[PDB]
Ligand binder design. Structure first.
Ligand SMILES: Nc1ncnc2c1ncn2[C@@H]1O[C@H](COP(=O)(O)OP(=O)(O)O)[C@@H](O)[C@H]1O
Ligand SMILES: Nc1ncnc2c1ncn2[C@@H]1O[C@H](COP(=O)(O)OP(=O)(O)O)[C@@H](O)[C@H]1O
Ligand code: BEF
Lengths: 99, 50, 148, 98, 50
C-alpha cells in the first residue's frame, strides 16, 4: 500500500500531455477519445483532472448526455466507464493558466 | 465487499438522487445521481461538495 | 444528573469501548473515550463507535437491517492511511450502510476500489456545478483462455 | 507562517535566525491547488520546512523536498530510516520485479 | 528550485538532525537526517511521526 501511494498520478504531466494531444488534433475531443488515445493508469483521478480542466476553461459538460469508454488494470481486470458528454477545445484550455 | 450492496435497496431505503436550486453557490437547477453501490464526491478546495 | 442516575435508565450504566484479541479472547485496551491515540487511530475509534451506534438508532429492536441505510462522511479519511481507511469501509459494509464519501481529491485510488460512481464538483467565479461519473466491472471474463 | 517569520527575525534583520518550521498533518484539508500555494508562501517567507503526512500527497512532497524519513511500526517498537527520494525510487524499482 | 534554496544554510540555522533514545516507541538509539533543502516525514497511521 505504501508503494501504491508512492506511485501517484503526476497531475502536472497529464495537463501537458492533454494539451499536446489537443494541439496535435485541433478538434473537439470527448472524454472517451481522451481515454482511448491517452489510456490512464489511474483512471478515476485522470478523468477528474479532465473534467476539472473542462469546467475551469468554461467548456460546460452535458451531464444528461452519456458516452462510454473501456479500460483495464495491471491485473487483467477490465472496467466499463460511464462518462458525461463534453468536448475539449485547445484554444480555451491554452488561454487558461494552469495551477 | 462491494457486492454486498445487493441487500441495500431491498431491505432498506438508500439515497439515489439530490436536487438543488439556488442553494449556496449552485445557481439555478443542479442534479447528481447517487449510485446504489456507494459513491464519492470529489473536487478541489472550495468546490461546493460540503 | 443525581435524579437522572435514579429514574433514568440511560444513566444507570456507564459505557466504554474495548479491543478484543481475536485468538485468545482477552482484552488489550479499555477505552472510555478517544484520548491519546495518533489520529487515524483516533478517527477509526470515532468512526467505528459512531457507525455501531448509528445502526442502533436507525434500527427497530431485533431488526437486522435499518429502514434508513445511508450515511454521509465529510472529509472522509482526512487523517488516516490507506490500510486504516480500508477497515472503516469494511465496518461500514458489515453493518449494511450505503456510504457517501467526500474528499478533496485524496485517497482517490481507495474510493476507486470501493465505489461505483463519483460526483465531480467544480467552481468558477461565483458559480458552481456538478457532473456525474460511473463505472462497472465486466466480470463475464477477464481474458478468455487465460488465467483469472 | 508570516507571523512566525517576523518573530524569528532578529531586530534590524530581514532573515530569521531560526529557520525550521514543522507542519504536522501538512495537507489533510487541501488539494494540490492549495498545498502548492502553501509551499510557495512557506518558502517565500524564508523558512525551511519539515512536513509530516501519513502517506498522503506523496507526489506533491516529491517535488518540493529532497529527502524523506520513512517511519514504520512493528509490534510495540518503531523504527525510522532516512533516505533520499531517488534511493526510495531505486527501492520501488526493486519492488517492481515482484 | 535551488535558486531559492541558497537562503537555507547561508542566513539561518537549519535543523539537520534529530536523535532519540527510549523516546516514545523508539527503543534504543535512533536518528533521522534532515536535508537542508526540506524534508518530508511519511509512514502509515500510528507509526511514530508525531
Ligand atoms: N456561509 C458562507 N460563508 C462564507 N463562505 C461561504 C459560505 N457559504 C459558501 N461559502 C462559499 O462557498 C463554498 C463553501 O465551502 P465548500 O467549497 O462547499 O467546501 P469544500 O472545500 O469541502 O468543497 C466555499 O467556496 C465558500 O467560499
Ligand atoms: N504517550 C502516549 N500516549 C498514548 N499513546 C501513545 C503514547 N506514546 C505512543 N503512543 C502510541 O504510539 C503512537 C504515537 O502516536 P503517533 O504514531 O506518533 O501518531 P502519528 O500517526 O501521527 O504518527 C501511537 O501508535 C500511539 O498508539
Ligand atoms: F496525527 Be499523526 F501526525 F499521524
Amino acid at each position: 500500500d505504501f508503494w501504491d501511494a508512492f506511485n501517484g498520478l503526476d497531475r502536472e504531466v497529464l495537463i501537458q500531455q492533454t494539451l499536446q494531444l489537443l494541439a496535435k488534433e485541433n478538434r473537439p475531443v470527448g472524454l472517451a477519445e481522451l481515454a482511448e488515445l491517452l489510456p490512464p493508469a489511474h483512471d478515476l483521478e485522470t478523468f477528474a483532472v479532465w473534467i476539472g480542466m473542462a469546467r475551469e476553461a468554461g467548456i460546460e459538460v452535458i451531464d444528461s448526455q452519456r458516452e462510454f469508454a473501456e479500460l483495464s488494470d495491471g491485473e487483467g481486470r477490465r472496467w466499463r466507464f460511464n462518462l458525461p458528454t463534453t468536448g475539449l477545445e485547445s484554444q480555451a484550455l491554452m488561454d487558461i493558466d494552469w495551477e | 465487499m462491494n457486492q454486498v450492496s445487493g441487500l441495500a435497496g431491498k431491505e432498506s431505503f438508500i439515497l439515489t438522487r439530490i436536487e438543488l436550486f439556488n442553494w449556496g453557490g449552485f445557481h439555478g437547477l443542479h442534479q447528481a445521481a447517487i449510485h446504489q453501490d456507494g459513491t464519492a464526491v470529489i473536487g478541489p478546495t472550495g468546490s461546493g461538495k460540503t | 444528573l443525581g435524579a437522572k442516575a435514579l429514574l433514568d435508565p440511560r444513566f444507570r450504566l456507564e459505557f466504554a469501548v474495548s479491543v478484543m484479541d481475536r485468538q485468545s479472547g482477552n482484552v488489550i485496551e479499555s477505552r472510555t473515550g478517544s484520548q491519546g491515540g495518533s489520529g487515524g487511530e483516533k478517527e477509526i475509534i470515532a468512526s467505528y463507535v459512531l457507525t455501531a451506534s448509528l445502526s442502533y438508532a436507525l434500527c427497530p429492536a431485533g431488526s437486522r437491517y435499518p429502514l434508513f441505510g445511508t450515511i454521509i462522511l465529510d472529509e472522509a479519511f482526512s487523517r488516516s492511511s490507506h490500510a486504516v481507511a480500508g477497515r472503516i469501509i469494511a465496518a461500514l459494509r458489515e453493518f449494511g450502510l450505503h456510504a457517501v464519501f467526500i474528499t478533496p481529491n485524496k485517497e482517490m485510488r481507495l474510493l476507486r476500489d470501493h465505489t461505483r460512481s463519483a460526483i465531480v464538483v467544480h467552481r468558477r467565479g461565483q458559480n458552481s456545478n456538478m457532473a456525474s461519473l460511473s463505472w462497472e466491472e465486466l466480470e463475464r471474463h477477464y481474458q478468455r483462455r487465460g488465467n483469472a
